[PDB]
Amino acid sequence: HCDAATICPDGTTCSLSPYGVWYCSPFS
């Protein structure tokens, strides 16, 4: 998970992209 080396905003989730990027969104 991205909660030990990224810490996404409150109420947001991060997912890996087919390119190799990590981003979080407040809308799942």
Curated annotation (Swiss-Prot):
Q: Which pairs are disulfide-linked?
A: C2-C14, C8-C24
Source organism, top-level taxon: Eukaryota
Tissues and organs where the protein is expressed, per its UniProt entry: Ubiquitous.
Q: Which GO terms describe its cellular component?
A: extracellular space
Asked if ATP-binding is a keyword of the record, the answer is no
Q: Which GO terms describe its molecular function?
A: cytokine activity
The reply to whether Plastid figures as a keyword in the UniProt entry is no
Q: Where in the cell is it found?
A: Secreted
What keywords would UniProt list here? Cytokine, Disulfide bond, Secreted
Q: What PTMs does it carry?
A: Granulins are disulfide bridged.
The free-text function statement in the UniProt record for this protein reads:
Granulins have possible cytokine-like activity. They may play a role in inflammation, wound repair, and tissue remodeling.
What is the similarity comment for this entry? Belongs to the granulin family.
Q: What is this protein called?
A: Granulin-1
The stretch of the full-length protein covered here is 3 to 30 of 57
